[PDB]
Write a protein that binds this DNA or RNA. Structure first.
Lengths: 144, 122, 130, 14, 189, 72, 120
RNA sequence: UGUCCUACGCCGGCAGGCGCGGGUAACCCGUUGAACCCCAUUCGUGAUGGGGAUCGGGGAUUGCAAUUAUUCCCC
């Protein structure tokens, strides 16, 4: 029963983690998730109705893969093409408050621990949870 | 009891560490099927599909990759894995297996052992 | 999907013909003063699934979409999203609609001619303002 | 039709 | 055994015309797993004849400027077009590709002789390497104008052009252009 | 002339969908969109419905091209 | 007349920091930064010209080179000439145009009427 | 590249503000966590959801001063 998150399809791992967070029930969801835009370079609201859980799941997995990351690094990770009009396109960071409240909601789930180093890292119980969903996807992948 | 090789393409350098194992091929803590350009997947199974899992029975190989892009990293990965197997069969296996494997790989393609000397120019 | 009998080919909304065969969000976008962002948020606030087409909607859903579109603010649409934030006349956070844009554009233009500002005279000659 | 206080520099604007 | 995309056989491919046999490089040692190889093939003259012909078709598929560097897209489009060919015809799509290249390449062409002002052209023979190159170029161009503004995906249109050229019917762009070039050359002499 | 496509099915269109479609050997949204002048979104909806029903085999799923097969 | 739903009388009697909510961002930033001594001198000049006027007659014209003035509600009724680099333009200060600068009321250039082109 | 480059937290729809540390630099920015590209969703051949000019409103910084839109953000 020894499996690792790194030996799992990352996309399906994010989807399964989002499903686990959704059927978990308790999670701090802001009231403006249906009006927010996720970056200054993005154009529309996301098509997925429950994008917040997927974002929190991907955030938790990113803190698993490389910890010690703050809000600024998380905005650096999710940046993209700013289509500046007739101007040449550039690179722009994501929305700061969205990532900040994602981290605040996840530490409200006691899954993310504040660090003396300066950033944030993953709790050991959160690591156990991530290993449990990783084993779930491994079982649903190698047997199907 | 172990060997350490490198393989470069443009800028990407993949370092391969090979030892006595149980038939597992690992890169950056991820399985070889778990690298994000699955379109270019058969290029990185070319040593395995060319050579079979029978001679990869007791080999543990780890690859850590720095720099480059995506395609150059994949070519560095396959080159590093192949050089690791060749050096392992040099140091710990006989020489006839070495020349047989080298003949098969060279008659397949040349880039999988020798690196492209061309790089980005000023 | 199946054939809906109660399908409206053309919608008649707010002095505007709406192509009913289109998607709901972009059919609402087809009128003046509503873009894809505003149509998406007013449809999310109406608790309506976004995957449906415009013509195969019931009348109560259409009228409640029009109701939420007419008065945004007390239906929890925030006052940074609307078209006209501070009107010069009354200063009310108001989202204006197809006749409203043209009417208030004309009144802004005519008050700018009455002011005799540089922008109003530039509009009168008909040159670039920005 | 010229306003009361405007100058020729801006009377050509009107 | 080496199978293109892991499924497609190469030993069933037979060359009809022996003049193009030594240049259509698909058969035994030139069969690979993927069209992507990124080898130095234009370093010295006639080295591109050693190139696998699927790689040639892929490399002539990125020609237009907005797709001028993307190769993984071209190899997945080649894979999809081979799927479309296999479900339509039922044959080996490599055989269909080889037949299309054979039936697409012009055999003679007009050329200008004399000086600047000599507006009469002489008909000359066409090299086999040039014949293969121009056949690939015309097939890819037929795939381009076959799919500019339509619902049809370019993989489907590339498969349709390849099948129409392998059948030799008067529907492919390459077949029509080859017929026009040969008629012009026969008129000039 | 402009192309007019049905965003929703018709009775004759549904009759040609349930019967005349799953014997076309190869199935893509483009060919079913061009033979019957059907909008492509309705085309993928129809092909997904027929795959869920089980009358049409599936070869390939991708972001750009999806390839289906007539069953036997 | 009304301005953001506020009429002129309670515009005049209102204190200074509630006008720091009723303008645009530019005018609020300028008046929060603080007006220069020349602004304040012109302000005294305008209030002096307004108080020293007959009730039925319009005030005396005050000429200025200042183009960065923001029209506060205190100057409604002032008879002001603005320099545009060459000539003064005299204007009544109307109350619907408080949220603007003075310099845009004297245009500094002429509208271009194109003549017959020369050799080129 | 840097004594203006920014790490972290909080307030923020977002431009941005607030409290704090490092770096006169293979140390801190920075494993420079780049974009194309890849995989899934919606669109479906029409001035279209392509293309974004031109305009109408608000907000925030830079600067003695942005009215003749400095710049950036949001409908």
């Amino acid at each position: 029963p020894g499996v690792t998150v790194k030996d799992v399809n990352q996309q399906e791992f994010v989807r399964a983690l989002a499903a686990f967070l959704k059927k978990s029930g308790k999670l701090k969801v802001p009231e403006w998730v249906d009006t927010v835009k996720l970056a200054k370079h993005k154009e529309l609201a996301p098509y997925d109705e429950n994008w917040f859980y997927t974002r929190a799941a991907s955030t938790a997995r990113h803190l698993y893969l490389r910890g010690g990351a703050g809000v600024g690094s998380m905005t650096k990770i999710y940046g993209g093409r700013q289509r500046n009009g007739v101007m040449p396109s550039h690179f722009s960071r994501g929305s700061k408050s969205v990532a900040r409240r994602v981290l605040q909601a996840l530490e409200g789930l006691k899954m993310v621990e504040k660090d003396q180093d300066g950033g944030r890292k993953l709790t050991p119980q959160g690591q156990r949870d991530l290993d449990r969903i990783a084993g779930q996807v491994a079982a649903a992948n190698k047997k199907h | 009891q172990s060997v350490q090789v490198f393989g470069r393409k443009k800028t990407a350098t993949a370092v391969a560490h090979c030892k006595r194992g149980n038939g597992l091929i690992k890169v950056n803590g991820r399985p070889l099927e778990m690298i994000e350009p699955r379109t270019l997947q058969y290029k990185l199974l070319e040593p395995v599909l060319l050579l079979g899992k029978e001679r990869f029975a007791g080999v543990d190989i780890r690859v850590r990759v720095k720099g480059g892009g995506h395609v150059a990293q994949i070519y560095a990965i396959r080159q590093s894995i192949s050089k690791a197997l060749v050096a392992y069969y040099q140091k710990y296996v006989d020489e006839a297996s070495k020349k047989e494997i080298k003949d098969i790989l060279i008659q397949y393609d040349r880039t999988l052992l020798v690196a492209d000397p061309r790089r980005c120019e000023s | 999907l199946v054939i809906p009998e109660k399908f409206q080919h053309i919608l008649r909304v707010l002095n505007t013909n709406i192509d009913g065969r289109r998607k709901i969000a972009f059919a609402i976008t087809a009128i003046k003063g509503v873009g894809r962002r505003y149509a998406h948020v007013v449809l999310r606030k109406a608790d309506i699934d976004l995957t449906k087409r415009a013509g195969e909607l019931t009348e109560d859903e259409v009228e409640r979409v029009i109701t939420i579109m007419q008065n945004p603010r007390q239906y929890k649409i925030p006052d940074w999203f609307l078209n006209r934030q501070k009107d010069v006349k009354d200063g009310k956070y108001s989202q204006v609609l197809a006749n409203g844009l043209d009417n208030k554009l004309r009144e802004d233009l005519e008050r700018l001619k009455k002011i005799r500002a540089h922008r109003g005279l530039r509009h009168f000659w008909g040159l670039r303002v920005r | 039709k010229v306003p009361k206080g405007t100058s020729s520099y801006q009377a050509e604007w009107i | 055994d080496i199978k293109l995309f892991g499924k497609w056989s190469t030993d069933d491919v037979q060359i009809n015309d022996i003049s193009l046999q030594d240049y259509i490089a698909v058969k035994e040692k030139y069969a690979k797993y993927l069209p992507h190889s990124a080898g130095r093939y234009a370093a010295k003259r006639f080295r591109k004849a050693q190139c696998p012909i699927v790689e040639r078709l892929t490399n002539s598929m990125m020609m237009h400027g907005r797709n001028n560097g993307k190769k993984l897209m071209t190899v997945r489009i080649v894979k999809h077009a081979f799927e479309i060919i296999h479900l339509l015809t039922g044959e080996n799509p490599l055989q269909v590709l080889v037949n299309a290249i054979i039936n697409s390449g012009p055999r003679e062409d007009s050329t200008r002789i004399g000086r600047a002002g000599t507006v009469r052209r002489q008909a000359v023979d066409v090299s086999p390497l040039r014949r293969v190159n121009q056949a690939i170029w015309l097939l890819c161009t037929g795939a381009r104008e076959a799919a500019f503004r339509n619902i049809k995906t370019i993989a489907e249109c590339l498969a349709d052009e390849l099948i129409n050229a392998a059948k030799g019917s008067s529907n492919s762009y390459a077949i029509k252009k080859k017929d026009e070039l040969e008629r012009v050359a026969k008129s000039n002499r | 002339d402009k192309l007019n496509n049905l965003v929703l099915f018709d009775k004759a269109t549904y009759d040609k969908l349930c019967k005349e479609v799953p014997n076309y050997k190869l199935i893509t949204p483009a060919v079913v969109s061009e033979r019957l002048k059907i909008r492509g979104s309705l085309a993928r909806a129809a092909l997904q419905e027929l795959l869920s029903k089980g009358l049409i085999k599936l070869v390939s799923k991708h972001r750009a091209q999806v390839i289906y097969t007539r069953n036997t | 007349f009304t301005y953001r739903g506020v009429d002129l009388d309670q515009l005049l009697d209102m204190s200074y920091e509630q006008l720091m909510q009723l303008y645009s961002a530019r005018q609020r930033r300028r008046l929060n930064r603080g007006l220069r001594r020349k602004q304040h001198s012109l302000l005294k000049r305008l209030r002096k010209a307004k108080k020293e006027a007959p009730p039925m007659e319009k005030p005396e014209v005050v000429k200025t080179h200042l183009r960065d003035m923001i029209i506060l509600p205190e100057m409604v009724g002032s008879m002001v000439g603005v320099y545009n680099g060459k000539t003064f333009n005299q204007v009544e200060i109307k109350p619907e145009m408080i949220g603007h600068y003075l310099g845009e009321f004297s245009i500094t250039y002429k509208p271009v009427k194109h003549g017959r082109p020369g050799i080129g």
